[PDB]
Amino acid sequence: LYAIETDEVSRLEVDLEEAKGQLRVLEAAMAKSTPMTRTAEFKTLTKNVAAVTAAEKADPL
Amino acid sequence: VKLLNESGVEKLVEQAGPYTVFAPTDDAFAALLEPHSFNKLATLLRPENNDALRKVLMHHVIPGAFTSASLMDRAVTVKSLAGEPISIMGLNKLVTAGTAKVVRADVPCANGCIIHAVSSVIIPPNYVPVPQPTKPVFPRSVIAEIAKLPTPRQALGLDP
Amino acid sequence: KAAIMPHQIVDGLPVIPNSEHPSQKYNVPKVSREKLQRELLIAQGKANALQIELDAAYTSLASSRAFLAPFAAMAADMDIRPLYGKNPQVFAGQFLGVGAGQWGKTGADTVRGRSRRVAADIGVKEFQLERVKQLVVDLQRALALEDAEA
Amino acid sequence: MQDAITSVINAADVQGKYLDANSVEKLRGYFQTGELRVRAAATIAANAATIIKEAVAKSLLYSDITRPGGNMYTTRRYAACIRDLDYYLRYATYGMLAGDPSILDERVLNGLKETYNSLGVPIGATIQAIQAMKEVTGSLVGSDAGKEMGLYFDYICSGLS
Amino acid sequence: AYDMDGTGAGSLEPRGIKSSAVEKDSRCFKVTFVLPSQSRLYTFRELQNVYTTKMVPFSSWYAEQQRIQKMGGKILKVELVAGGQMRSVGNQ
Amino acid sequence: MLDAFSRVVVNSDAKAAYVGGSDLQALKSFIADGNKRLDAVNSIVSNASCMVSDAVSGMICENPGLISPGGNCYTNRRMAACLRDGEIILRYVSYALLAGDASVLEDRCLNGLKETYIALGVPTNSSIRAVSIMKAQAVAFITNTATERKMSFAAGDCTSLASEVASYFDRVGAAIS
Amino acid sequence: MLDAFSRVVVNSDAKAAYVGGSDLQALKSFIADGNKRLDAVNSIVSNASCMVSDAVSGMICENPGLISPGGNCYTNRRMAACLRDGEIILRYVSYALLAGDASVLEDRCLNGLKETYIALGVPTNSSIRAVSIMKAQAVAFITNTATERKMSFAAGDCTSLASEVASYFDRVGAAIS
Amino acid sequence: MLDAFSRVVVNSDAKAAYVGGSDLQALKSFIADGNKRLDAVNSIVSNASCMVSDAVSGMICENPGLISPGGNCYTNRRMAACLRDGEIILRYVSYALLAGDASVLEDRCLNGLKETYIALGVPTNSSIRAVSIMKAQAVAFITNTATERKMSFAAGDCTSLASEVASYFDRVGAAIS
Amino acid sequence: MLDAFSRVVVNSDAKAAYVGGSDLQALKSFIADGNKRLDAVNSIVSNASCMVSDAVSGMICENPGLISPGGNCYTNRRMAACLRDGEIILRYVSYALLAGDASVLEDRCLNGLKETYIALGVPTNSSIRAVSIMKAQAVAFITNTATERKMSFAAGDCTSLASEVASYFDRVGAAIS
Amino acid sequence: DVVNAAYPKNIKNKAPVISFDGKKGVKLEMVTLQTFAGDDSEDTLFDYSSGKFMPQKPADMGIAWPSGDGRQAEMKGGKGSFNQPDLRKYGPFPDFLKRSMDL
Ligand SMILES: C=CC1=C(C)[C@@H](Cc2[nH]c(/C=C3N=C(/C=C4/NC(=O)[C@H](C)[C@H]4CC)C(C)=C/3CCC(=O)O)c(CCC(=O)O)c2C)NC1=O
Ligand SMILES: C=CC1=C(C)[C@@H](Cc2[nH]c(/C=C3N=C(/C=C4\NC(=O)[C@H](C)[C@H]4CC)C(C)=C\3CCC(=O)O)c(CCC(=O)O)c2C)NC1=O
Ligand SMILES: C=CC1=C(C)[C@@H](Cc2[nH]c(/C=C3N=C(/C=C4\NC(=O)[C@H](C)[C@H]4CC)C(C)=C\3CCC(=O)O)c(CCC(=O)O)c2C)NC1=O
Ligand SMILES: C=CC1=C(C)[C@@H](Cc2[nH]c(/C=C3N=C(/C=C4\NC(=O)[C@H](C)[C@H]4CC)C(C)=C\3CCC(=O)O)c(CCC(=O)O)c2C)NC1=O
Ligand SMILES: C=CC1=C(C)[C@@H](Cc2[nH]c(/C=C3N=C(/C=C4\NC(=O)[C@H](C)[C@H]4CC)C(C)=C\3CCC(=O)O)c(CCC(=O)O)c2C)NC1=O
Ligand SMILES: C=CC1=C(C)[C@@H](Cc2[nH]c(/C=C3N=C(/C=C4\NC(=O)[C@H](C)[C@H]4CC)C(C)=C\3CCC(=O)O)c(CCC(=O)O)c2C)NC1=O
Ligand SMILES: C=CC1=C(C)[C@@H](Cc2[nH]c(/C=C3N=C(/C=C4\NC(=O)[C@H](C)[C@H]4CC)C(C)=C\3CCC(=O)O)c(CCC(=O)O)c2C)NC1=O
Ligand SMILES: C=CC1=C(C)[C@@H](Cc2[nH]c(/C=C3N=C(/C=C4\NC(=O)[C@H](C)[C@H]4CC)C(C)=C\3CCC(=O)O)c(CCC(=O)O)c2C)NC1=O
Ligand SMILES: C=CC1=C(C)[C@@H](Cc2[nH]c(/C=C3N=C(/C=C4\NC(=O)[C@H](C)[C@H]4CC)C(C)=C\3CCC(=O)O)c(CCC(=O)O)c2C)NC1=O
Ligand SMILES: C=CC1=C(C)[C@@H](Cc2[nH]c(/C=C3N=C(/C=C4\NC(=O)[C@H](C)[C@H]4CC)C(C)=C\3CCC(=O)O)c(CCC(=O)O)c2C)NC1=O
Ligand SMILES: C=CC1=C(C)[C@@H](Cc2[nH]c(/C=C3N=C(/C=C4\NC(=O)[C@H](C)[C@H]4CC)C(C)=C\3CCC(=O)O)c(CCC(=O)O)c2C)NC1=O
Ligand SMILES: C=CC1=C(C)[C@@H](Cc2[nH]c(/C=C3N=C(/C=C4\NC(=O)[C@H](C)[C@H]4CC)C(C)=C\3CCC(=O)O)c(CCC(=O)O)c2C)NC1=O
Ligand SMILES: CCC1=C(C)/C(=C/C2=NC(=C\c3[nH]c(/C=C4\NC(=O)[C@H](C)[C@H]4CC)c(C)c3CCC(=O)O)/C(CCC(=O)O)=C2C)NC1=O
Ligand SMILES: CCC1=C(C)/C(=C/C2=NC(=C\c3[nH]c(/C=C4\NC(=O)[C@H](C)[C@H]4CC)c(C)c3CCC(=O)O)/C(CCC(=O)O)=C2C)NC1=O
């Protein structure tokens, strides 16, 4: 009965379905583009940036 | 944040206690032009009625850190720092705070506090709107009021 | 029908040397009619917000007296006899009266207490309201001459 | 932690140049007021307890922060105030002698407004206490010395705001 | 007991850090700061990290915060993680 | 000016009606309680010098800025013209208590009083908490509950005269607000 | 809505009654006509549930191709969104009438609105008709010259408040043209 | 649907535990106040027909654009449907106060009601008013402080049941917002 | 009797001129087609606020860059000053229509205006665009060929006065060019 | 600039307001008819501040502290004689972060 917190593969597949369930409500809300105002809500830093990713890349114009 | 700074409530939510703020986006404040809600809230626009403004803003602060994940099909109430109970209501991933209908899930803050974006402004339950400023009226005569009081001989039915 | 504006009474009164707030009748700059209307409505708005924090000071004075009124009347029928100061047969030293500069600028500033301390808050808050209520008078009065000569 | 002489030497040193006429011009201006600052710091040391007793009784003695529920109710909380107001009157004395407010933000201002918000200390009543404390300090040291000591009080009030 | 017995100026124990902490206080901060030593170049001791973030109690935050600036430290952030605010009884 | 009986005539003149029989039932109970009204204005006029000195010097206890330099009760010409004005207000309140109707207070005293006090530089907020000390003094003298002076009356109940003179005193503070 | 004036704070522990350093001078001076302004916003938002249904159906009966199949208001998702955009515009006009400046109108409502409607295929020449009905509707309420609804007010004048709110409605209509 | 018993079942099913002695005290106290809850529903059902006419007409006298032509309370079918959904909402709240859990309120009453009121073109701002007038009546009937009908109840307290039905009407008003 | 109009005009201060019965028929005999001409200026000034709020807004409806940040019908004091200037030219046309000459319109209202609008940075092509709208309205109101309104007049022809009001509006645009 | 002497102090007086009040005379008035005004300027003619004032805080000098190291934000006074320039640059810094020249 406790094998949904203690298992090593039910822990992935539960957290896959909640993260896909959070993705499906976020992808549908990103079908609304032009007069939508922007709030930088400052999401967290649980996963660090693996790439360098400088803000100025080049002149691609 | 501007209403907090003017009203002096912002000192209260400066504190380190674990709070769960239900700060409404200004579209919620822009949505205060209901024909209905403008009755009970327009009177606060007057500059002397800061008194109720603290009591209406302090209903949005909840002692404790209630994240939306902590509201998995759970209905728990609590009173604000205003002093009156509010029912937080998370079912079908639709977390409610009175008449909130929360927009953004949570924002992690400094002292383990949480910030949820709501769609409207929660008015406290037993909040009566302040009346508009009126005219102190005085009775013009005194004989229209002695004639307005029933005599003892009237109360016993001795007279009409 | 028409109330007399308070700047038209100031023109009738003879001039005193000392005001609390001396007038800027001659010290208003020659600006246009539209900048006089903006500077009047700003000074009327600052006087409205200064009124409703002076009223919050009066409710704090009324709350400070109710805080101490069970003890203010409970010490009113005690026998409080001092050691000196009343009859001249006892050595009182500096408290024959008060000694050497310690009477103060007013006399009420040497009295301690919760209701005397919120009262000094009232007198500094009513000074700022009366200063800006006399500033809307000569802003209005120039308005009379902005229009009367117009 | 720099005085007027330390700040003058730093700016003249940070460009690698000697003390020219402009750098010594301010230094002479500081030495002229050297006699005023010591006597100002003299009387403030004498009437330290009297000044703080005058400020709290004139600003926040009887307000409802003093009553129950207010921010200053319990005796530990009241005693923390006069301990707390002592630093403002003391560190302002240091700025008045050093002629430079660098010591204030170095040792007072940093983490101060962020600390009062943690404790829930009312910044509004705090500044008015310092303003009232600035008002009595101009009584003792005189006008211009009060202008000097007063110049660092509102520096605390500005940053603490 | 607590640090406010009556000690002030002119008292037998030396004039020192006086904290407004109650009997056995249970409030503690979460502070963050850098504190360069400014003494290693004539002592030549080993080096230790100066950027620390730790929980200091309310009983001794003021002494620590008063000392962190003594040696030129800068306090980046402090919070009251454990304890209440405006709480008359219960800080014990 | 009007009194209590001229007030009921100008209501009856508005409909061109005679003062009949049903509205004489209330006028006969006004004159039946007319001896309590004369017994009430006698408890104000007898105490009237100490009423405006308990009030003006109690206004100073809540505002030390009046007796600071530049203040409104500062110099001797200015304290004398405030002790003058405090007993003019007590004079016209006792006229309307005697006349039964507040018409002599509203046009001979309270009309134009606010913008009079702007022009001289009088603080109108200090006048409101000065005439509210006299309001509490008068209702202690009507109902014989002052602590330092008791007067000798017959037995009964004068609470309706207490809240009629209380309404003449918050009619003053509505005019200088 | 509650940013559109200035409250004053009087209690302690506020850090705006003492250290705040400013009364809002441009917003203390807007309660100087503020009883006239609050009645004017009360005329609109007590009729805004009738104003948006009259204006949207005004352009349907003046242009019947919008409820044609293939028209932009045929489906029930589109008919609900056209009623929602009229109310949201009418609220932000009622912000700018209340606040006295059109900064809040051109920031939240009008910024990026012409680029929205030509991306969605919304006809702009018919949409300005629906705003200009509400321009003609709102001046009838504020001057109280509406036909089938009058409202009780205090006696006076309300021109240059109907003329102020006519200056916001074309400002909407030129930003979307 | 669920109730106050089966809410702590499916909460104890999530932890895969038995309903032990630490959770029966949430239920044995609920049944010990079972007579108070049945006396609390009976204040609502006995005034259920006059509360809905009290509340929909109070929506009309605050928002008079609903009875104007082009509104949403205009015709007799539209008025009787607005008297229907005032009491259909009141039917499910009185189930949800009786059951002790808001599952019946969030699966039958609120089962896409926001999607209905958009697609019907019902103004959602006025239906927040019509729900919340019934909230302000139900906390006056349960606490027996209605101003014009007192029911005879045994003395005690109902601040818990008044605050429970105030959280069911806000949960309706949160979801149709 | 025409001097008593101009004595109110040229006296460099404020006045009025109430015209009575026996003075009226001397004016109607003096003014040629006076019963048409007194209907001609009545068809303008009874629709004065409707004609301004088209003509200021129709300038913005064709030139939308004026209410852009940086335009001149931004910053609401400037937007209200354009509407007062549009109201002044509409009035001073109608006095020239009443008096039958463009002389009083030229010296009081129109001389020095070309130097005024280039001293304030007023875009002078849009002011000709604004008065061409008011030129288009006043020929329609006089001829009773207005669109949403029609006026109840005595029947006849007023094309000669409609050409006469065409000759006043272009003199404005010939001056501010 | 006030070039408006051509528009004198009888400026916006608005003579042609005409009210017929029936079939009778035209009743021409002289009403000025002001706008929805507001006259927007900053720094008006008086103070309008009665106490409650300590708002002033110095500018942020980056990560050092405010107003501490302004030795890079100064004019200059001296330079010296035997100073000789540098080869690498490593261009100019935010004030050598926290310690001053008198550390
Ligand atoms: C049976 C014969 C007979 C007449 C000839 C008239 C004579 C007459 N006409 C008018 C009606 C009038 N209406 C006008 C108006 C006019 N507008 C214009 O553009 C034209 C120039 C002019 C028409 C010629 C004039 C000038 C008079 C005459 C002056 C007058 O008495 O008012 C009036 C005034 C009362 C009224 O309006 O009826 C009288 C007594 N009446 C009669 O009963
Ligand atoms: C809390 C909400 C709130 C409101 C709704 C208003 C309500 C309101 N309006 C006015 C008072 C007034 N209101 C109006 C407005 C109007 N009169 C008309 O004939 C026009 C049609 C209409 C403008 C659209 C006028 C002209 C006055 C008189 C005072 C004045 O002109 O400043 C007053 C003062 C009453 C008095 O002292 O006489 C109040 C309380 N104020 C508030 O605080
Ligand atoms: C030192 C500071 C100082 C004060 C704070 C006041 C004290 C004071 N006294 C009264 C109140 C009063 N003052 C009087 C006056 C008198 N009593 C008598 O018996 C005499 C005949 C007469 C003086 C000649 C009376 C009758 C009351 C009413 C209280 C009572 O005794 O019942 C009030 C009114 C309360 C209110 O605001 O509503 C106040 C504030 N006076 C001061 O001096
Ligand atoms: C020339 C001056 C002059 C006066 C001063 C009064 C004097 C006066 N007072 C009362 C008589 C009275 N006075 C009062 C009044 C009061 N009693 C109280 O307990 C209250 C403290 C106070 C209310 C104000 C009462 C209750 C009576 C007796 C009942 C009554 O007369 O109606 C009476 C008796 C009338 C009667 O009994 O028929 C008289 C003559 N009349 C005058 O002609
Ligand atoms: C804060 C300001 C603010 C606004 C002004 C509106 C603006 C706006 N309208 C629409 C979206 C829309 N707006 C309309 C409205 C209309 N089309 C017409 O033909 C009529 C002329 C007009 C009604 C009067 C329609 C029909 C859609 C839906 C378009 C579609 O889905 O095809 C959208 C896209 C997202 C949505 O579906 O809502 C936005 C952002 N929303 C806002 O948040
Ligand atoms: C062919 C279809 C058609 C319609 C649906 C209506 C809709 C409609 N009404 C008005 C015009 C108006 N509409 C209103 C609105 C209202 N009046 C009230 O009493 C209510 C409170 C509220 C409607 C619920 C007002 C006040 C006016 C101004 C004219 C008037 O006073 O009636 C206009 C603008 C007309 C103009 O500006 O000249 C339109 C298109 N008219 C039509 O021609
Ligand atoms: C499951 C729960 C449940 C409800 C809550 C109700 C609510 C409800 N009302 C209507 C239908 C309606 N509902 C309203 C109601 C209102 N319009 C207003 O202006 C007011 C704000 C509000 C009344 C208070 C009106 C006016 C209609 C008529 C629409 C029509 O006839 O097409 C409909 C569509 C039904 C139909 O027309 O076929 C529904 C589902 N019925 C339910 O089964
Ligand atoms: C302008 C129009 C208008 C109305 C029609 C009434 C309607 C109305 N009544 C109440 C408030 C209430 N309404 C009722 C309803 C009723 N009383 C009963 O005993 C019956 C069951 C039922 C009438 C048949 C009750 C019980 C209260 C609580 C207070 C009380 O009456 O004791 C409220 C909520 C409080 C408020 O916002 O005012 C409203 C809007 N009020 C208005 O402002
Ligand atoms: C079949 C239908 C049915 C009912 C209608 C109720 C009837 C009911 N109510 C109560 C009993 C009660 N009801 C209340 C409730 C209240 N009292 C107040 O003063 C408040 C206004 C109100 C709160 C909502 C209280 C306080 C008691 C007594 C204490 C208790 O039972 O817990 C009791 C127990 C005491 C008794 O025997 O009367 C019963 C049977 N039960 C039922 O089975
Ligand atoms: C009796 C005769 C009479 C007139 C003819 C007008 C002429 C006039 N216009 C303005 C003043 C103005 N006039 C305009 C007008 C416009 N700018 C535009 O973009 C539009 C094209 C146009 C309106 C449709 C503006 C915007 C100002 C104000 C300039 C400013 O404040 O920046 C001023 C004030 C100048 C000053 O104070 O120095 C005057 C006298 N007024 C009069 O009293
Ligand atoms: C007081 C009531 C009243 C009105 C509302 C107007 C209505 C009106 N507008 C115009 C005529 C016009 N009206 C406008 C105004 C506008 N057009 C637009 O593009 C926008 C929709 C709107 C600005 C918001 C314009 C631009 C013209 C045409 C002017 C021209 O010829 O260029 C005409 C002239 C037609 C004719 O004479 O036959 C009339 C009667 N007139 C009145 O007497
Ligand atoms: C007291 C103030 C006063 C006025 C407001 C006017 C109004 C007016 N005009 C005419 C009479 C008239 N009015 C007009 C005018 C017009 N007819 C049209 O077809 C055009 C649309 C419109 C031109 C704008 C004409 C053509 C006549 C008839 C000829 C004339 O009398 O001049 C009449 C007489 C009608 C009758 O005999 O019953 C009156 C009262 N005259 C006044 O004395
Ligand atoms: C709950 C614990 C607690 C205490 C004890 C407390 C005391 C306290 N005593 C005060 C004043 C005062 N206290 C006294 C007391 C005395 N005078 C004497 O002669 C006696 C020896 C003694 C009383 C028995 C006096 C005279 C003042 C006013 C001093 C002044 O006005 O300067 C004040 C300032 C005014 C006020 O806000 O009340 C406080 C806060 N606060 C607290 O929270
Ligand atoms: C040298 C620079 C410096 C300052 C300024 C400083 C302040 C400081 N003030 C404190 C508390 C406090 N400060 C106050 C002060 C006040 N209450 C009021 O109402 C007034 C507005 C105000 C007096 C002016 C109170 C009441 C506490 C106790 C708070 C508590 O027990 O929760 C504390 C908590 C620990 C302690 O006091 O022992 C610190 C560290 N520390 C420093 O290093």
Tokens standing for residue I34:
């006076």
Neighbours of chain F (3+ CB pairs under 8 A): B, C
CA-to-CA dists, residue C89 to C92, F82, H127, angstroms: 9, 40, 85
**Residue I96, amino acid:** A
Q: Which residues contact B157 (CB under 8 A, 6 or more apart)?
A: none
- Residues of chain J with C-beta less than 8 angstroms from the C-beta of C148: none
Our answer on whether the CB atom of I53 is closer than 6 Å to any ligand 12 atom is no
Give, for ligand 2, the residue of B132, B134, B135, B137 to mutate: max count of ligand atoms closer than 8 Å to Cβ. Answer: B132
Among D71, D107, D111, the residue with its CB nearest the CB of E78 is: D111
Among J37, J40, J51, the residue with its CB nearest the CB of C128 is: J51
Contact B56, B42 (CB under 8 A): no
Q: Decide the pairing of beta strands E28-34 and E51-57.
A: antiparallel
Work out the widest C-alpha separation in chain D, in whole angstroms: 61
Our answer on whether the CB atom of D70 is closer than 6 Å to any ligand 13 atom is no
Give the span between the Cα atoms of A15 and C39, in whole angstroms.
63
**Residue C72, amino acid:** A
- What are the binding residues of H for phycourobilin? 50, 61
Which residues form the domain of H126?
1-177
Cα D148–D151–D152 angle (5° rounding)?
105
φ, ψ at B77 (rounded to 5°): -105, 170
Q: Can you tell me which atom of ligand 5 is nearest the CA of G126?
A: 21
How much distance in Å is there from the Cα of G56 to the middle of ligand 5? 13
Q: How far apart are the first and last CA of chain E?
A: 12
Chain-chain contact of E85 with B17 (C-beta, under 8 angstroms): yes
- Residues of chain H with C-beta less than 8 angstroms from the C-beta of B87: 163, 166-167, 170-171
Contact F71, F54 (CB under 8 A): no
Q: Is H160 exposed, middle or buried (0-12, 13-18, 19+ CB in 10 A)?
A: middle
DSSP 3-state of E28: strand
How much distance in Å is there from the Cα of G155 to the middle of ligand 2? 8
Cα G115–G120–G126 angle (5° rounding)?
85
Q: DSSP per residue over C9-78, as a string?
A: HHTTSPPPS--SS---SS-S----HHHHHHHHHHHHHHHHHHHHHHHHHHHHHHHHHHHHHHHHTTSTTS
Q: Can you tell me which atom of ligand 5 is nearest the CA of G86?
A: 24
Give the span between the Cα atoms of D107 and D87, in whole angstroms.
10
Give the span between the Cα atoms of H151 and H41, in whole angstroms.
13
**Residue F151, amino acid:** M
Tell me if there are at least 3 CB pairs under 8 Å linking chains D and G. yes
Q: Is G152 exposed, middle or buried (0-12, 13-18, 19+ CB in 10 A)?
A: exposed
Contact C45, G24 (CB under 8 A): yes
Chain breaks in chain A (C to N over 2.5 A) after: none
Q: How many residues are there in chain A?
A: 61
Tokens standing for residue H137:
């009546």
φ, ψ at F75 (rounded to 5°): -90, 180
Give the span between the Cα atoms of I15 and A29, in whole angstroms.
66
Tokens standing for residue J42:
């900053």
Q: Which residues contact H88 (CB under 8 A, 6 or more apart)?
A: H109
DSSP 3-state of J28: strand
Tell me if there are at least 3 CB pairs under 8 Å linking chains D and J. yes
How much distance in Å is there from the Cα of G134 to the middle of ligand 5? 17
Q: Is F87 exposed, middle or buried (0-12, 13-18, 19+ CB in 10 A)?
A: middle
Nearest CA, atom 26, ligand 6: G146
Our answer on whether the CB atom of G110 is closer than 6 Å to any ligand 2 atom is no
Q: Decide the pairing of beta strands B20-21 and B114-117.
A: parallel
How much distance in Å is there from the Cα of F43 to the middle of ligand 4? 11
Which residues face B117 on adjacent strands? B104
Chain-chain contact of J28 with I75 (C-beta, under 8 angstroms): no
Tokens standing for residue F100:
């039964």
Q: How many CB atoms lie within 10 A of CB C94?
A: 9
- Residues of chain B with C-beta less than 8 angstroms from the C-beta of D124: 8, 11
Contact D71, D65 (CB under 8 A): yes
When divided into structural domains, chain I yields a total of: 1
Q: F61 a known binding residue?
A: yes
Please tell me which residue of chain D has the smallest CA distance to C116.
D62
Our answer on whether the CB atom of I35 is closer than 6 Å to any ligand 1 atom is yes
Please tell me which residue of chain B has the smallest CA distance to G31.
B46
Which ligand does the CA of H73 lie closest to?
7
Q: How many residues are there in chain I?
A: 177
When scoring J98, J100, J101 by the number of chain E Cβ atoms within 10 A, the one with the most, hence best to mutate, is J98
How much distance in Å is there from the Cα of F31 to the middle of ligand 4? 12
Give the span between the Cα atoms of C74 and C70, in whole angstroms.
6
Give the span between the Cα atoms of C28 and C32, in whole angstroms.
11
Among F65, F69, F116, the residue with its CB nearest the CB of C123 is: F65
Q: Can you tell me which atom of ligand 14 is nearest the CA of D91?
A: 1
Contact J103, E38 (CB under 8 A): yes
**Residue G137, amino acid:** Q
CA distance B34 to chain H (A): 6
Q: Which residues contact E78 (CB under 8 A, 6 or more apart)?
A: D111, D114, D115, D118, E29, E30, E31, E32, E61, E65
**Residue H157, amino acid:** D
Torsion of CA D129, D132, D137, D142, to 10 degrees: 160
Give the span between the Cα atoms of F75 and C20, in whole angstroms.
12
Residue I123, domain CATH: 1.10.490.20
DSSP label of C103: T
Q: Which residues contact G79 (CB under 8 A, 6 or more apart)?
A: G73, H121
Give the span between the Cα atoms of H172 and B92, in whole angstroms.
14
Chain-chain contact of C37 with J39 (C-beta, under 8 angstroms): yes
Helix (H) or strand (E) holding E52, with range, is strand E51-57
Give the span between the Cα atoms of I98 and C149, in whole angstroms.
29
Torsion of CA B40, B41, B44, B45, to 10 degrees: -130
Residues 87-106 of C with CB under 8 A from F: 105-106
Sign of the Cα pseudo-torsion (H8, H9, H11, H12, in order) = positive
- Residues of chain B with C-beta less than 8 angstroms from the C-beta of C48: 47
How much distance in Å is there from the Cα of B124 to the middle of ligand 9? 28
Centroid of chain to Cα I45: 9
**Residue F108, amino acid:** R
Please tell me if residue F102 touches chain B, with a CB cutoff of 8 Å.
yes
When scoring J31, J36, J46 by the number of chain C Cβ atoms within 10 A, the one with the most, hence best to mutate, is J46
How much distance in Å is there from the Cα of I19 to the middle of ligand 1? 21
Cα B24–B29–B33 angle (5° rounding)?
145
Give the span between the Cα atoms of H122 and H129, in whole angstroms.
13
Which ligand does the CA of H116 lie closest to?
7
Please tell me if residue G21 touches chain D, with a CB cutoff of 8 Å.
yes
Resolution of the deposited coordinates, in angstroms? 4.3
Please tell me if residue J26 touches chain C, with a CB cutoff of 8 Å.
no
Give the span between the Cα atoms of H110 and H170, in whole angstroms.
12
Give the span between the Cα atoms of B6 and B10, in whole angstroms.
8
Please tell me if residue G152 touches chain B, with a CB cutoff of 8 Å.
no
Contact H170, H135 (CB under 8 A): yes
3-state helix, strand, coil in chain C (%, to 5): 55, 0, 45
Tokens standing for residue G28:
């203390």
How much distance in Å is there from the Cα of H61 to the middle of ligand 8? 12
Give the span between the Cα atoms of H14 and H9, in whole angstroms.
9
Which ligand does the CA of I145 lie closest to?
11
Q: DSSP per residue over B18-79, as a string?
A: -BEE-PBPHHHHHTT--TTHHHHHGGGGSTTTHHHHHHHHGGG--BS---GGGGTTEEEEEE
Please tell me which residue of chain J has the smallest CA distance to E76.
J63
Q: Which residues contact B71 (CB under 8 A, 6 or more apart)?
A: B88, B89, B90, B95
Centroid of chain to Cα G139: 12
DSSP 3-state of F72: coil
Categorise residue H75: left if φ over 0, alpha if ψ from -120 to 50, beta otherwise.
beta
Contact H129, B49 (CB under 8 A): no
The H-assigned helical ranges of chain G are 25-28, 34-45, 48-62, 76-99, 103-104, 114-120, 124-142, 162-175
Among D101, D110, D154, the residue with its CB nearest the CB of J54 is: D154
Contact D15, D108 (CB under 8 A): no
CA distance E67 to chain J (A): 17
Categorise residue E75: left if φ over 0, alpha if ψ from -120 to 50, beta otherwise.
beta
Give the span between the Cα atoms of G110 and G131, in whole angstroms.
13
Contact D118, B12 (CB under 8 A): no
Q: Which residues contact G59 (CB under 8 A, 6 or more apart)?
A: G66, G126, G129, G130, G133
Chain-chain contact of B46 with G31 (C-beta, under 8 angstroms): yes
Residue whose tokens read 């008791």: F150
Tokens standing for residue F93:
């309140």
Q: Can you tell me which atom of ligand 4 is nearest the CA of F155?
A: 19
